[PDB]
PDB file of C-alpha atoms in Angstrom:
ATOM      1  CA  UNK Y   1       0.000   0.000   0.000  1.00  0.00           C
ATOM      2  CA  UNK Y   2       1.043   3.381  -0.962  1.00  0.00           C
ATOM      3  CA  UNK Y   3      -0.250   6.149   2.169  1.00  0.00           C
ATOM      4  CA  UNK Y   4      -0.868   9.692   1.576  1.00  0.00           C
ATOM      5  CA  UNK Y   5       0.932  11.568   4.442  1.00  0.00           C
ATOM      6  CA  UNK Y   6      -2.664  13.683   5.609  1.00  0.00           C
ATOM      7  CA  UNK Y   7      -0.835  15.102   8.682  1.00  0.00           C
ATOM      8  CA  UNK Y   8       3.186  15.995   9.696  1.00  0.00           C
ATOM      9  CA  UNK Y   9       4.703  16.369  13.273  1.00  0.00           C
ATOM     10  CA  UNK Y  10       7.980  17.200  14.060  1.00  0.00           C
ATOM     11  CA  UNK Y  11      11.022  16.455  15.743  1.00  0.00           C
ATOM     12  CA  UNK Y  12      12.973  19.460  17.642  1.00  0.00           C
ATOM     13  CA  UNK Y  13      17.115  17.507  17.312  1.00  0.00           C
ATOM     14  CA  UNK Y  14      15.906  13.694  15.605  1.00  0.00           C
ATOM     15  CA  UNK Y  15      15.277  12.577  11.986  1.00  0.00           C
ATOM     16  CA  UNK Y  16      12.113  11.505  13.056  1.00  0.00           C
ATOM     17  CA  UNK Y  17       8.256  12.703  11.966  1.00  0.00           C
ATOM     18  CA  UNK Y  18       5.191  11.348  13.171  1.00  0.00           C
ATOM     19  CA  UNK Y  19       3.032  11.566  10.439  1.00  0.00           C
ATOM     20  CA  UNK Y  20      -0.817  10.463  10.329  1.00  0.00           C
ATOM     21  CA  UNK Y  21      -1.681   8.897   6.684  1.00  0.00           C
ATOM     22  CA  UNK Y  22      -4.521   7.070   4.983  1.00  0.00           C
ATOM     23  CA  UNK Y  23      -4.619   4.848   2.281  1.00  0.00           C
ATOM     24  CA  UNK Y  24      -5.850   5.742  -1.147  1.00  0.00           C
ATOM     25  CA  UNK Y  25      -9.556   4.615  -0.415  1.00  0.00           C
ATOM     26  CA  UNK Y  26      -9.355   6.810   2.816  1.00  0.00           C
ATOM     27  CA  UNK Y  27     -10.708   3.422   4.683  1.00  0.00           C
ATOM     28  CA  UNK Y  28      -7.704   2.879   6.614  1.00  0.00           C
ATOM     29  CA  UNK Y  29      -5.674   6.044   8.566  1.00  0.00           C
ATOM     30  CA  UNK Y  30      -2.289   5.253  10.835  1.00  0.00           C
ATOM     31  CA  UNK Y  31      -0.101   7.187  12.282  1.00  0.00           C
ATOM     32  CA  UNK Y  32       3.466   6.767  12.113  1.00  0.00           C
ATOM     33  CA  UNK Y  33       6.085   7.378  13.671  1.00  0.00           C
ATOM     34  CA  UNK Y  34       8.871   7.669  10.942  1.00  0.00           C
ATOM     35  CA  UNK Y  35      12.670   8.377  10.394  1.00  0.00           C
ATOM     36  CA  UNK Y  36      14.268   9.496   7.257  1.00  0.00           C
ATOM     37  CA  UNK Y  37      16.456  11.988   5.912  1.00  0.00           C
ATOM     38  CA  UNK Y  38      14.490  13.896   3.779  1.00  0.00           C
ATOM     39  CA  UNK Y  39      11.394  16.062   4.358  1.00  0.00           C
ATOM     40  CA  UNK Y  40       7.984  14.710   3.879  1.00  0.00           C
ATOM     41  CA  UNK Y  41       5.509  16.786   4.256  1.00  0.00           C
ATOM     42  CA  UNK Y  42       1.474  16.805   3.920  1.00  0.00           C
ATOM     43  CA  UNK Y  43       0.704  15.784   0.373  1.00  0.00           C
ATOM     44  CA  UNK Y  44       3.267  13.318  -0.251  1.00  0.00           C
ATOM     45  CA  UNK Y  45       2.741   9.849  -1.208  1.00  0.00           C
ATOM     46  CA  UNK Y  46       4.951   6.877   0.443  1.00  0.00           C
ATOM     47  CA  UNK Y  47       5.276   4.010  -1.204  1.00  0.00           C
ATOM     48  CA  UNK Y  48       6.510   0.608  -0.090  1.00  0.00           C
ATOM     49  CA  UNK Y  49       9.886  -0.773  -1.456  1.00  0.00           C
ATOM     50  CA  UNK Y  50      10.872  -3.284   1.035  1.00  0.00           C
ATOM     51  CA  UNK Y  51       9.853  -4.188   5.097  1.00  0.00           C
ATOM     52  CA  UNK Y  52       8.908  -0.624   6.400  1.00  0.00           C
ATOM     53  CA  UNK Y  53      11.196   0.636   3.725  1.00  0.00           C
ATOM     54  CA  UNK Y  54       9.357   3.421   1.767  1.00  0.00           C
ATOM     55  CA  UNK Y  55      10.318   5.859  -0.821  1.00  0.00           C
ATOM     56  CA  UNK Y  56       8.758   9.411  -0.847  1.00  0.00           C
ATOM     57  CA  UNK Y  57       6.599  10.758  -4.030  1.00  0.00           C
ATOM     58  CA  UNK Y  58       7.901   7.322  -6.043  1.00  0.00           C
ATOM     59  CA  UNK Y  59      11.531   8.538  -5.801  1.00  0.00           C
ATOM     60  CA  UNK Y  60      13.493   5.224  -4.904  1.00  0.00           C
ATOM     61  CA  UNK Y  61      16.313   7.550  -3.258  1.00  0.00           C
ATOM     62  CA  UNK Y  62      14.446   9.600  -0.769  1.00  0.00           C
ATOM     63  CA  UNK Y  63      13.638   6.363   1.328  1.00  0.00           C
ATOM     64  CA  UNK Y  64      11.742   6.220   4.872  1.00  0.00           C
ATOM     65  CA  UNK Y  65      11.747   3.917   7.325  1.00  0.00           C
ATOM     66  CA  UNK Y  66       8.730   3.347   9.731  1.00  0.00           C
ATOM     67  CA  UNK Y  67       9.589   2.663  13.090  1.00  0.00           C
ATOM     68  CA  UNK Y  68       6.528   2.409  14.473  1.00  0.00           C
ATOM     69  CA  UNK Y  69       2.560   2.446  13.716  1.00  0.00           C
ATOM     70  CA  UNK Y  70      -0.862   2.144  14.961  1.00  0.00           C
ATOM     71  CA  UNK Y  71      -4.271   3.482  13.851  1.00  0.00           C
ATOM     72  CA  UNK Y  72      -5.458   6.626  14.338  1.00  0.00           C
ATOM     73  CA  UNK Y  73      -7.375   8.065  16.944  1.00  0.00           C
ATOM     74  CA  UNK Y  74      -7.850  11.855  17.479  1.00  0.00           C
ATOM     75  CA  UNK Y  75      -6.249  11.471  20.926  1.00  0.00           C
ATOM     76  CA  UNK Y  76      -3.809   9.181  19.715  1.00  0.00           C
ATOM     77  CA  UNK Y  77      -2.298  11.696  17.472  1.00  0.00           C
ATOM     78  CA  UNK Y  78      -1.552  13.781  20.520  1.00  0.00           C
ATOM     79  CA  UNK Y  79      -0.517  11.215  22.620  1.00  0.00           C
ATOM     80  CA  UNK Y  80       2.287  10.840  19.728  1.00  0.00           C
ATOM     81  CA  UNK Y  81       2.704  14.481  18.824  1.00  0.00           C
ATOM     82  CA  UNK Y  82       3.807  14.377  22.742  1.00  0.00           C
ATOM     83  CA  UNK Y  83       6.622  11.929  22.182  1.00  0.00           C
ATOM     84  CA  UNK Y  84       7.849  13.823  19.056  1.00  0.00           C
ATOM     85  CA  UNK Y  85       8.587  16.918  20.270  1.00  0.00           C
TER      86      UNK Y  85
ATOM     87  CA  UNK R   1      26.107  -9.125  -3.972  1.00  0.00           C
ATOM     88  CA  UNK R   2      27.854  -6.620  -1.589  1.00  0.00           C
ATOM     89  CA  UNK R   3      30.571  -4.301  -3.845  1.00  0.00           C
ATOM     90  CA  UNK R   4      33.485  -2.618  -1.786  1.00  0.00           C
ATOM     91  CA  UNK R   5      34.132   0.969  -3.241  1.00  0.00           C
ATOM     92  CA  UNK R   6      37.295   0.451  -4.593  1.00  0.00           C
ATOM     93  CA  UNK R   7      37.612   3.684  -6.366  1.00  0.00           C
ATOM     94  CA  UNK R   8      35.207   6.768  -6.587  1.00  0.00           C
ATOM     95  CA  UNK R   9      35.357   9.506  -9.300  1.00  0.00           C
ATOM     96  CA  UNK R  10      33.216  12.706  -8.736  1.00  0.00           C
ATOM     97  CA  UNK R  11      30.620  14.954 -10.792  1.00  0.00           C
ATOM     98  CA  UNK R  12      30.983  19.126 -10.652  1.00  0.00           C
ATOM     99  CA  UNK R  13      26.956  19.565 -11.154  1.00  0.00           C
ATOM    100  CA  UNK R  14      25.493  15.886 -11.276  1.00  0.00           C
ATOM    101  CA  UNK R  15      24.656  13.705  -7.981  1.00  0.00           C
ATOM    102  CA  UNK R  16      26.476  10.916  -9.773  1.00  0.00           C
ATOM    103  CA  UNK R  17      29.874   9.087  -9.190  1.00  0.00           C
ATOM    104  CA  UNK R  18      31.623   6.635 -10.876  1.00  0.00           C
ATOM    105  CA  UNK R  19      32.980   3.876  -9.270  1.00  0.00           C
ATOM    106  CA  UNK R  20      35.256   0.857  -9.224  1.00  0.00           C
ATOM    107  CA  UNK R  21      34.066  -1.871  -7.148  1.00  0.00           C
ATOM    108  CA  UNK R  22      34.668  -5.130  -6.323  1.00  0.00           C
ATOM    109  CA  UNK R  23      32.913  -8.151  -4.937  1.00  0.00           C
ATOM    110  CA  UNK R  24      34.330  -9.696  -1.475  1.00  0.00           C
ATOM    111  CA  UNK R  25      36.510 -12.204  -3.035  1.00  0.00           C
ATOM    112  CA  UNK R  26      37.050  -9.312  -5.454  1.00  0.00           C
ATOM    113  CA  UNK R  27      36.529 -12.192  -8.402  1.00  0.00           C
ATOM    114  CA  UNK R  28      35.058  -9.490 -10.249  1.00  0.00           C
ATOM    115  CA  UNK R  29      35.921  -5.791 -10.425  1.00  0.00           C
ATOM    116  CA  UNK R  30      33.265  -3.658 -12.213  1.00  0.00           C
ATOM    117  CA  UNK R  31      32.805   0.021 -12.891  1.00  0.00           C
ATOM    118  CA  UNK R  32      29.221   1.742 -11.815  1.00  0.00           C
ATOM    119  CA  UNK R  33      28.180   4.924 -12.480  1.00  0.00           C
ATOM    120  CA  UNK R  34      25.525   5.409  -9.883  1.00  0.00           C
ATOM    121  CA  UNK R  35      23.575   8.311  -8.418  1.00  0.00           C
ATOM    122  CA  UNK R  36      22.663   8.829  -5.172  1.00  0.00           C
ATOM    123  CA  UNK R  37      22.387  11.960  -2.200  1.00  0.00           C
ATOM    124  CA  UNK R  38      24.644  10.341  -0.074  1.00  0.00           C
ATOM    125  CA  UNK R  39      28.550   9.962  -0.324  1.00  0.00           C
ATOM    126  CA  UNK R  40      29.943   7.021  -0.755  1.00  0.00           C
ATOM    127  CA  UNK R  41      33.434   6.529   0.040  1.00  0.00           C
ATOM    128  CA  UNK R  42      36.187   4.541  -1.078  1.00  0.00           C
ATOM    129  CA  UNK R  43      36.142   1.352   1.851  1.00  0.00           C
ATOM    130  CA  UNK R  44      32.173   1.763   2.008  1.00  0.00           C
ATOM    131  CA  UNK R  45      30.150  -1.350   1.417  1.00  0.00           C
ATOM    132  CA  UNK R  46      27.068  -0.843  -0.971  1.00  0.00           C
ATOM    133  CA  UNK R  47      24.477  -3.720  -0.273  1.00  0.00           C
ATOM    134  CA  UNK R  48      21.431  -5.049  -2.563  1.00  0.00           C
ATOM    135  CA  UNK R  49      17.945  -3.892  -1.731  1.00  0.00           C
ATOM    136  CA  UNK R  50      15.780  -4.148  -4.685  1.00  0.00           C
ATOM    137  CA  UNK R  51      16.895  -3.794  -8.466  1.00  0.00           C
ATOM    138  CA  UNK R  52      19.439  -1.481  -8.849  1.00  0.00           C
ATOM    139  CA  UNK R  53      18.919   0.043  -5.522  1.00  0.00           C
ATOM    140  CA  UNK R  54      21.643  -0.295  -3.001  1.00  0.00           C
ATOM    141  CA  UNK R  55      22.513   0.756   0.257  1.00  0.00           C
ATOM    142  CA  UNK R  56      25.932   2.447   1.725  1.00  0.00           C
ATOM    143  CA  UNK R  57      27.491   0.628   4.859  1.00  0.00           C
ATOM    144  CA  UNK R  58      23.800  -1.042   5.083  1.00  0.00           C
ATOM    145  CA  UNK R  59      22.146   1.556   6.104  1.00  0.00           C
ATOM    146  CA  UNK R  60      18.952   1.393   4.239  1.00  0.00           C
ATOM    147  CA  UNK R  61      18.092   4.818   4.411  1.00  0.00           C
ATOM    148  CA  UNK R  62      21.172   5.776   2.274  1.00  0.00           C
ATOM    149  CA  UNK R  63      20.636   4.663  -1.271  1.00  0.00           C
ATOM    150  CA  UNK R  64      22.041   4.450  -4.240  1.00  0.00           C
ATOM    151  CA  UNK R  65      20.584   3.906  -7.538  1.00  0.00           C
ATOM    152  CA  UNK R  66      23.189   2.119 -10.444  1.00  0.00           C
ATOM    153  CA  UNK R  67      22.418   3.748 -13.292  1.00  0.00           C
ATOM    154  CA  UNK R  68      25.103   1.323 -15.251  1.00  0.00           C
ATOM    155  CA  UNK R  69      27.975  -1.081 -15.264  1.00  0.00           C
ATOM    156  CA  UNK R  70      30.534  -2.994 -17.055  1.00  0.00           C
ATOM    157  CA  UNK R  71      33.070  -5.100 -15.866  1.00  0.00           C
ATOM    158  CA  UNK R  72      36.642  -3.092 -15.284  1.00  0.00           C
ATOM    159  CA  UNK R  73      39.169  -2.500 -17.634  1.00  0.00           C
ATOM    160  CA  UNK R  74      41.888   0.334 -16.545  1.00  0.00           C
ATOM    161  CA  UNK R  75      41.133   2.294 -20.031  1.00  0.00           C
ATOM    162  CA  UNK R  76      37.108   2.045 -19.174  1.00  0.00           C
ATOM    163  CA  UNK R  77      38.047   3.523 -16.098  1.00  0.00           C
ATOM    164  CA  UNK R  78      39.477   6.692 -17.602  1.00  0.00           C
ATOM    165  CA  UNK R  79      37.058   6.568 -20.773  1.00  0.00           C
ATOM    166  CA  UNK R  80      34.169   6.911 -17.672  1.00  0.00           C
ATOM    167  CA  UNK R  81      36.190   8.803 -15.450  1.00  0.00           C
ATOM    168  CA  UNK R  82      35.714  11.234 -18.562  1.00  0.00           C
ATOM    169  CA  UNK R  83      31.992  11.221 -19.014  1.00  0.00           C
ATOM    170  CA  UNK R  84      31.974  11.445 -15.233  1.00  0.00           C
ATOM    171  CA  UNK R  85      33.443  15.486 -14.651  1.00  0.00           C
TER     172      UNK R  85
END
């Protein structure tokens, strides 16, 4: 599955984003918690390459690698947005 | 197949090297031009992920994408060491 990154979170000294993202279909939403080296930011599209190896907008190069994931609640979110920061 | 960098060879504008490698056994020596955001060093390791698509010092989030080979000659070095800068 390829995820549409609907919200981004930061990360004040990591490479790490928690980022909440739904499938194309919308059925499904996650959040993520997320390290790469490039930016990803609301908009983008992730899609899978390998084991919680993702690319970024289909460009092999700019990879992602989830770290962690559950669904989404509303509180969840900040919950997460909590250990982010 | 790992590759050891055996010998790198720079762009002035491009995010592409060429490079010497060989396998570990170093049976076969080829020459890659690849592209990737990260720099890859001579004594770094580049490790299969998917087709084409390597990693540096197996760290997944720094790829590398071959954009060709051949198999090493010392003149194919400098004819690519050419094309290269």
């Amino acid at each position: 599955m390829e995820w549409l990154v609907k919200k981004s979170c930061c990360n004040k000294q990591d490479n790490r984003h928690v980022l909440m993202l739904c499938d194309a279909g919308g059925a499904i939403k996650m959040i993520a918690e997320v390290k790469s080296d490039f930016a990803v930011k609301v908009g983008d599209l992730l899609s899978p390459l390998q084991n919680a190896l993702y690319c970024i907008n289909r460009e092999k190069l700019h990879t992602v690698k989830v770290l962690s994931a559950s669904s989404y609640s509303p509180d969840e979110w900040e919950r997460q947005c909590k250990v982010a920061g």
